[PDB]
Write an enzyme that holds these catalytic residues in place. Sequence first.
Site, PDB file in Angstrom:
ATOM      1  N   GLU A  16     -71.891 107.158  32.695  1.00 11.38           N
ATOM      2  CA  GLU A  16     -71.959 107.399  30.774  1.00 11.38           C
ATOM      3  C   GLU A  16     -72.979 106.125  30.641  1.00 11.38           C
ATOM      4  O   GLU A  16     -73.233 105.740  30.804  1.00 11.38           O
ATOM      5  CB  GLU A  16     -70.528 106.623  30.290  1.00 11.38           C
ATOM      6  N   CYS A  63     -65.490 103.152  24.288  1.00 12.96           N
ATOM      7  CA  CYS A  63     -66.077 104.366  25.154  1.00 12.96           C
ATOM      8  C   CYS A  63     -65.131 105.876  25.443  1.00 12.96           C
ATOM      9  O   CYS A  63     -63.655 104.756  25.389  1.00 12.96           O
ATOM     10  CB  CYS A  63     -66.645 103.711  26.479  1.00 12.96           C
ATOM     11  N   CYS A  66     -63.664 105.444  29.887  1.00 15.13           N
ATOM     12  CA  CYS A  66     -62.893 104.703  30.166  1.00 15.13           C
ATOM     13  C   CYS A  66     -62.453 104.611  28.402  1.00 15.13           C
ATOM     14  O   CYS A  66     -61.581 103.479  27.565  1.00 15.13           O
ATOM     15  CB  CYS A  66     -63.984 103.623  30.773  1.00 15.13           C
ATOM     16  N   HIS A  70     -59.897 100.382  26.367  1.00 20.90           N
ATOM     17  CA  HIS A  70     -60.072  99.089  24.733  1.00 20.90           C
ATOM     18  C   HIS A  70     -59.376  99.808  23.774  1.00 20.90           C
ATOM     19  O   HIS A  70     -58.802  98.601  23.423  1.00 20.90           O
ATOM     20  CB  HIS A  70     -61.808  99.857  24.118  1.00 20.90           C
ATOM     21  N   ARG A 461     -63.141 100.295  36.251  1.00 17.46           N
ATOM     22  CA  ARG A 461     -64.757  99.586  36.335  1.00 17.46           C
ATOM     23  C   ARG A 461     -64.484  98.247  36.361  1.00 17.46           C
ATOM     24  O   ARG A 461     -66.044  97.546  35.905  1.00 17.46           O
ATOM     25  CB  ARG A 461     -65.866 100.073  35.504  1.00 17.46           C
ATOM     26  N   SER A 484     -68.656  96.663  32.716  1.00 17.41           N
ATOM     27  CA  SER A 484     -70.815  97.811  33.123  1.00 17.41           C
ATOM     28  C   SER A 484     -71.475  96.026  32.386  1.00 17.41           C
ATOM     29  O   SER A 484     -72.344  96.178  32.760  1.00 17.41           O
ATOM     30  CB  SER A 484     -71.055  98.344  32.915  1.00 17.41           C
ATOM     31  N   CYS A 528     -71.011 102.146  32.770  1.00 19.65           N
ATOM     32  CA  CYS A 528     -70.887 102.721  31.358  1.00 19.65           C
ATOM     33  C   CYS A 528     -72.236 102.438  30.729  1.00 19.65           C
ATOM     34  O   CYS A 528     -71.639 100.535  30.359  1.00 19.65           O
ATOM     35  CB  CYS A 528     -69.043 102.732  31.573  1.00 19.65           C
ATOM     36  N   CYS A 531     -69.953 101.108  27.298  1.00 21.49           N
ATOM     37  CA  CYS A 531     -69.021 100.220  27.112  1.00 21.49           C
ATOM     38  C   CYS A 531     -70.306  98.797  27.938  1.00 21.49           C
ATOM     39  O   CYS A 531     -69.740  97.764  27.144  1.00 21.49           O
ATOM     40  CB  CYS A 531     -68.181 100.076  29.414  1.00 21.49           C
TER      41      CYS A 531
END
Lengths: 534, 267
Positions: A16, A63, A66, A70, A461, A484, A528, A531
């Site tokens: 991503e 994101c 994922c 969030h 992640r 990330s 990501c 992210c």
Amino acid sequence: SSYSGPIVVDPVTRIEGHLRIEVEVENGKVKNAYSSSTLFRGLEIILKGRDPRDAQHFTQRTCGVCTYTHALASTRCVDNAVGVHIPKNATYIRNLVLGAQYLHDHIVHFYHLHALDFVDVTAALKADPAKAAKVASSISPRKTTAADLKAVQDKLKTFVETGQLGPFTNAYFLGGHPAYYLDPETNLIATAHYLEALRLQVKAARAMAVFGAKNPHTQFTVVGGVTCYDALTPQRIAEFEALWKETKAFVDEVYIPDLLVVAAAYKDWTQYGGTDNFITFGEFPKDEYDLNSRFFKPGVVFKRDFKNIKPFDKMQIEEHVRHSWYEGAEARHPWKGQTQPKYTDLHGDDRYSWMKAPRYMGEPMETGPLAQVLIAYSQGHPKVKAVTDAVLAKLGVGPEALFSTLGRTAARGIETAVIAEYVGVMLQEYKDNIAKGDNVICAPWEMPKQAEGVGFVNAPRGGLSHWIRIEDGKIGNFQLVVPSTWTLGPRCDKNKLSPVEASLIGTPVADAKRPVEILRTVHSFDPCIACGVH
Amino acid sequence: LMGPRRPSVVYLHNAECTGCSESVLRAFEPYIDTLILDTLSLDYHETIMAAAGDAAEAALEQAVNSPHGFIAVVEGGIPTAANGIYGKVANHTMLDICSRILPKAQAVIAYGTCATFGGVQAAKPNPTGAKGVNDALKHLGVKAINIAGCPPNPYNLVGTIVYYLKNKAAPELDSLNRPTMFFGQTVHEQCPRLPHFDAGEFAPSFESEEARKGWCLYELGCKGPVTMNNCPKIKFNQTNWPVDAGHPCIGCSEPDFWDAMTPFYQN
Ligand code: SF4
Ligand code: SF4
Ligand code: F3S
Ligand SMILES: [Mg+2]
């Protein structure tokens, strides 16, 4: 002799977001690396002054890979700031949607993002489908026949002979490549399962929408709980359970056996891509205010010393900007965070990324499936120990093999398998709780004028945290510190290489024009960049 | 990557969260494998393409310059502040990339509220000067079909593409350039809770017995009455949509919704 000079990979695809990797190679091996994130959006700036209840809707758009994670972290963060203890059923439903997210995410990562680094799809055309079917049936309880795989081959053949290779255009394996090892039959099994996974992931994602309204970007969380009274019904629970069971079967019967057959073929990849330090926040709580109540527990490890796991102290996180495109050089704890963009172009004033560089007690920390798995193993987690031991035994390697690109990729499968089983436990507890007559899913709460809060999620992640300062009942500061960012952010003001940068040192590069070995390690972290930068 | 028989699609990622790309992967009857193998030729797409780096750049050039023509699908807003510096791919600004490629497309579809209208990074105070595609590229004559939502229903993207391939033209578009066949009704007029709205039966809180019984979510902020989308009709993932999950509509197919529809829990 071998190649000496720079290699740049921009864009890094099959991640991503927007990543530029720069390396220096000397005699065919990487000697230096930079992780440059090349998109900024500034969601933390945009949140200032807004209603804290609105934060989860904005931050979910950090994101869509994922997705949900969030929203969950911001809701845990505002729940915490307000002091609400959500009902047991909201914890169960939130946890079940998160478990479903892990299964969808990791399946798509292995097949649709990682596997083209290891699978030559066009060589599948030369395979013997009868031989391939026998191999596929030897590695899985699922029976595969020659005709099954011929159908895939026939379809791929028509596709390739049209000359329109689409997503396979200019693939690093076209024409052959010395770092691609698989025989045609194994390439055909993996390619069949890549295609199968494109439809299975529809079901894995649908499981999130049963309770969570839709995927991507769920819409069922609120401060104080969840909104989805329909999630209490036997019909929705049955629908979830059926999708979970089919998803778990795919994990157990298709993904993990493929992961093991590919890792066995690439066992030299135990020698590249290792890292020193690990952080994880734990996930799937029984108590929203106690991380140690989570099925996976938090912890910190330095220099691979897993006999001395350190407690996680949330006050020891600081985010560096010295090598990032932000003002100044001062690291900040996220409750005193600053997001002040200042672009200097690539390596201008030694800055080369829109990610900040989080450090824990000043050290760079890998987070993600390898941190979650290794730390849980070392805490005596029985399910994690049972399947990592089985994986180590199948591969014929020792635990040291896990500190590598191969080991990280295997840890992603281990945690998928472990979470796929634990979702069934969570589901049963949820059912049991409803059966006791608890039908409550949201609790009342009051907005304080002044407060601090933090929400912790261990996402696919790794360790995700959202941090809020509430002032006059509004967002005074809102900071995201995302997995990330930890793994793929740049160097800090002590010039320490981040986990991805450090892990790249020593990578061999057979063909500088097709540097698949760099992608293997970078993709093993599952980057990501939306992210990481937000 | 393409010549022959399947129509070429170049899929670009600007300032985006990849939720719109993920929504396309949820395509159902047809599924995404039928779409990529049979219906279309997906000739550039950073999330799933095999090539990276220079090899990926070469794939893009060869697709855009094909004498056979290509369709562009664009995800994400274009950051325009500071001469486009906040978003680069292959060390080119996204503004430059889109300025050079999109006027060459036979047709452009802006997919998702970010590409259509600027989206989340364009919310106040818009530090990166993010703009939707048609706003950014007005001066170059680009007129993208706008398929809005955050992310949109993928039914609406496939439906627009199929229409386009059949009829060699855009379907009827509204004044925000969205196809009326999908965006012609408010989500409210299609909502199963409308009888409660009519009767002034509103949930006062999410924990209330009224919310448990499925009363209308308007007092809790629902933006269904001012939002055009086909959510209650098509649903998502063949199974649900926000207010059947008990949560108000946040207006996510409308321009500027991050600022117009907030606070999300007030009307
Ligand atoms: S429209 Fe929404 S889902 Fe799509 S890229 Fe933008 S923020 Fe992500
Ligand atoms: S819940 Fe929303 S869309 Fe449904 S009737 Fe009420 S205001 Fe309209
Ligand atoms: S929030 Fe968006 S997905 Fe539909 S229900 Fe409202 S337009
Ligand atoms: Mg941040």
